[PDB]
Amino acid sequence: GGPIKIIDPEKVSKEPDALLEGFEWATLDLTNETELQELWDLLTYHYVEDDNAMFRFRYSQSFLHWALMSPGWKKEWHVGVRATKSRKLVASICGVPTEINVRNQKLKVVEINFLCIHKKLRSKRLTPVLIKEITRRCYLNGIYQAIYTAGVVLPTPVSSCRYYHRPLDWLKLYEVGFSPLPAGSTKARQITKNHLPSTTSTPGLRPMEPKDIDTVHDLLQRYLSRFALNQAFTREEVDHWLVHKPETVKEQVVWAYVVEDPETHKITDFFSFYNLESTVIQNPKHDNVRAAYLYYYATETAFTMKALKERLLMLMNDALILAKKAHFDVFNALTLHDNPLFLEQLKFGAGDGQLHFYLYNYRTAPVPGGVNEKNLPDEKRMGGVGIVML
Numbered sequence: 001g002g003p004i005k006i007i008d009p010e011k012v013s014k015e016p017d018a019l020l021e022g023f024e025w026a027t028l029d030l031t032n033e034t035e036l037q038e039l040w041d042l043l044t045y046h047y048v049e050d051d052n053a054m055f056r057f058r059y060s061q062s063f064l065h066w067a068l069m070s071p072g073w074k075k076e077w078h079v080g081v082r083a084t085k086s087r088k089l090v091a092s093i094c095g096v097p098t099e100i101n102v103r104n105q106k107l108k109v110v111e112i113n114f115l116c117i118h119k120k121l122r123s124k125r126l127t128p129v130l131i132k133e134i135t136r137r138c139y140l141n142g143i144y145q146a147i148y149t150a151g152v153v154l155p156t157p158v159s160s161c162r163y164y165h166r167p168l169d170w171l172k173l174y175e176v177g178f179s180p181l182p183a184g185s186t187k188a189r190q191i192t193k194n195h196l197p198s199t200t201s202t203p204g205l206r207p208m209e210p211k212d213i214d215t216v217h218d219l220l221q222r223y224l225s226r227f228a229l230n231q232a233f234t235r236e237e238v239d240h241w242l243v244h245k246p247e248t249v250k251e252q253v254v255w256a257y258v259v260e261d262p263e264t265h266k267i268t269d270f271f272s273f274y275n276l277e278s279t280v281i282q283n284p285k286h287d288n289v290r291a292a293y294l295y296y297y298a299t300e301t302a303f304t305m306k307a308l309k310e311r312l313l314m315l316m317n318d319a320l321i322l323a324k325k326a327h328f329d330v331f332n333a334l335t336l337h338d339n340p341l342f343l344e345q346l347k348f349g350a351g352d353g354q355l356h357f358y359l360y361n362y363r364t365a366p367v368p369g370g371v372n373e374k375n376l377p378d379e380k381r382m383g384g385v386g387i388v389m390l
């Protein structure tokens, strides 16, 4: 496929459209602590909830810094709406630039994320106005395509992936209302079921060091080449998205571990996961759930069997152990990548959550999301989604 429409830079308006009475546009400068705080204060209380919520995403200020100021970031693409009188931030839509591969065609796109409207300004119909504005600010910088992720079904989706959840602290998930008691079982037997070993198994497993950047960049891109829709990682993107800088970063957000074969001594494997907290609304016992999310990963055994199934089962179980020691409660993953190989065997529970992938101004054939028609993981429905959006 290809682009749907060609944009004339000559017809892109210098000024933005009109907003609701009493509200004005604002470019967020996330280099300043006050403005980063303002966005955090908005999202913590007004961002993605579940239906019964219960739960709401608590993206940390260290996460927001990490997700919105990646290589090539422009402040223009951190769009906010302020109340004219009070100066309070009441809405947001954000974007960062990246390259994605859509069926071998390379594309300049913006990753659209953190769409948020204050609860008091709900519909209203403010979303299309927020979409049009960040679209205009992209059009002025020479970006006419977008990739975005949404848990709601919208016009013409590219793919659909189901959420999966591995309990590291089952009692915690049970007490907050996330994990049920199925069916004629006790609490203790569910905890005994989710018991993990204390030590990692994979030979030569260690945290990723900045020396591993070039080698991880090559391995990851060769692995992502196996997917129809994937992120064309640059060296700086590998550095930013995959190596934690504790200098610098006081509240760790990303985790990366590598192997590091005892004989090569070239690296043959790597996996990663990030820190995204969720607030429990009706507190009682707990008020916070710490969740780890499977990020990017690769392995040399893929380029062959199915020994890839065997290898990922060892690596991802190791990732669960390392997540537990890092005090995470649940390990989240989607049916994207080669995940339908290890998910069910490693005691990941089928989730109610569904994540849909979309493209703006780019027509392409439907891409498999790792699930069959029953929404169950399928080995034959992989090789599609190779991009993880935060």
Ligand SMILES: CCCCCCCCCCCCCC(=O)SCCNC(=O)CCNC(=O)[C@H](O)C(C)(C)COP(=O)(O)OP(=O)(O)OC[C@H]1O[C@@H](n2cnc3c(N)ncnc32)[C@H](O)[C@@H]1OP(=O)(O)O
Residues within 6 Å of the ligand: 046, 047, 048, 049, 110, 112, 113, 114, 115, 116, 117, 118, 121, 122, 123, 124, 125, 126, 127, 128, 131, 134, 135, 136, 138, 139, 143, 144, 145, 146, 148, 149, 150, 151, 152, 154, 360
């Ligand atoms: C080249 C540059 C292009 C870049 C742009 C690419 C496009 C990217 C688009 C942005 C992708 C962002 C990716 C993420 O960040 S996904 C996360 C979205 N955020 C949340 O879920 C946070 C909690 N929710 C809210 O704050 C609000 O409920 C939101 C803001 C979602 C809607 O506020 P409200 O409830 O007050 O609704 P409205 O009256 O203003 O407007 C109603 C319209 O909004 C459309 N809607 C609903 N949900 C979503 C959604 N998740 N993605 C896109 N659109 C959505 C819907 O079709 C409806 O249109 P229509 O069916 O009536 O016709």
Ligand SMILES: Cc1c(NS(=O)(=O)c2c(Cl)cc(-c3ccnc(N4CCNCC4)c3)cc2Cl)c(CC(C)C)nn1C
Residues within 6 Å of the ligand: 048, 049, 050, 051, 055, 056, 057, 113, 149, 150, 151, 152, 163, 165, 178, 278, 289, 291, 330, 332, 351, 352, 353, 354, 355, 389, 390
């Ligand atoms: C709804 C929710 C859950 N449950 S869940 O099944 O894992 C889940 C569910 Cl139901 C829905 C989403 C969800 C919904 C809508 N959009 C998104 N995306 C928005 C764009 N960025 C990626 C996430 C995710 C994400 C998750 Cl992680 C959780 C994890 C619990 C273990 C606390 N937190 N929250 C706020």
